[model samples]
Target: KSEGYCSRILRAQGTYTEFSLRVEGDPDFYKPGTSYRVTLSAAPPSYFRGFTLIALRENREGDKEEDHAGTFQIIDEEETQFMSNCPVAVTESTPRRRTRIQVFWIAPPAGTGCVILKASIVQKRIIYFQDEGSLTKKLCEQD
Candidate 1:
């Protein structure tokens, strides 16, 4: 049902230039059970109408099931919502256009090596960016 909803808007980043995503601490490595503040903003002269944010385990493309590595803490309920099967991920709560959004993400426990912040930024119905301007800052798990 939810997947159906996501697909209805389906469809459409390697040239992800219109938006920016950042982590607050900018730490050299991430510790388990820790929380990090994350921000996503629109570039000048442009704004995103909606987005889906997820932190997936790094270097595991061979796996069958999608491996979501961390959980997102919603800072603004009116602006964001959680996704099914991946509790740590989130999608836009509304279609209301805006320049930016901020949320918190908690790292998973040990045994996990690294995680990357992935996002799908929707600028409008037909144009969107996926997997672009991403993974530049991978959060590697540490003690």
Candidate 2:
């Protein structure tokens, strides 16, 4: 099992100050059936040992929910694994301690509306971050 919430990290240290969950491909928005490149990376000095990436769909009220919105394809199988328990999420296979990780997020059906991409980054055992680097609902809608 993986630390989906990054609960093992010490609360006193707080979220990891560096690093971001970067999404590439679409500059403005996402289309139904489209896949985007997502990466968790930081500067030269920063690196991570663990991570969790997931996407959420927004309701009519413009609020995000826990349900997985889209599917994730493992681009780096050596370092990542698909979670059968949460089909839309991916986690580290061995936590080999790396600086960056990448995955592909396939969008949901048409009219799915706004979607939020979130990631939890872990640096060592005592340092980590939850919701530290998130793509807001601005990445919304389908044509």
Candidate 3:
């Protein structure tokens, strides 16, 4: 069983996007040799393709590292979901969209410790467009 959980929501790139991070187990209630599961979800409206999810953590030597990396493809017109399980420590969620994100932590072991989780998102932008025409013909005629 676990106790003491909290979550936070943040807006990225103005009102175009938002994200949230949920953490389970209090810092003072963390136990060693225990495992925990975290689930992250991103639901974007139209005008968006998909989002990417990544998990980062710090090693015992105080060095930052990436535990997992994956891309969540947008299915239908609904939301995308990403989930991960790891040892009790620290975890984070990164969403690729100018929208909101939510995180949920599972039960923790018994101990006097804590874990921290953060969430972030990136907004999608329209950067390319194709024009219909005869490129070859236009170039040859000009030449």
Against the reference, the lDDT scores of all candidates come to 0.66, 0.62, 0.27
Q: Which segments of model 2 are wrong by more than 4 Å?
A: 1-15, 59-66, 122-138
Model 2 weakest 10-residue run by lDDT: 58-67
lDDT of 1 by residue, 11-97 (tens): 131236667788997787888888898888887887877777767677543112355576689999887888553345577878887
Estimate the lDDT of model 1: 0.66
lDDT of 3 by residue, 15-134 (tens): 222233323232333233333333334344422233333322211111112222121222222344432222222222333343333333332223322223333233233111111111
Q: Would you estimate the TM-scores of all the predictions?
A: 0.74, 0.71, 0.27
Pairs of colliding residues, candidate 3: 17-98, 17-99, 18-99, 18-100, 27-113, 27-114, 30-113, 97-122, 98-123
List, residue by residue over 19-87, the lDDT tens digit for candidate 2.
667778545778778788888776678777767666766432112224457778999787799644454
Judge candidate 3 at residue 111 and give its lDDT.
Answer: 33
Q: Which portions of model 1 miss their true places by more than 4 Å?
A: 1-15, 61-66, 84-86, 123-136
Find the candidate with the highest TM-score and give its number: 1
The local lDDT score (0 to 100) that residue 26 gets in candidate 1 is: 74
The ten-residue window of minimal lDDT in model 1 covers: 5-14
Error of 1 at 20 (Å): 1.1
Ranking by TM-score: 1, 2, 3
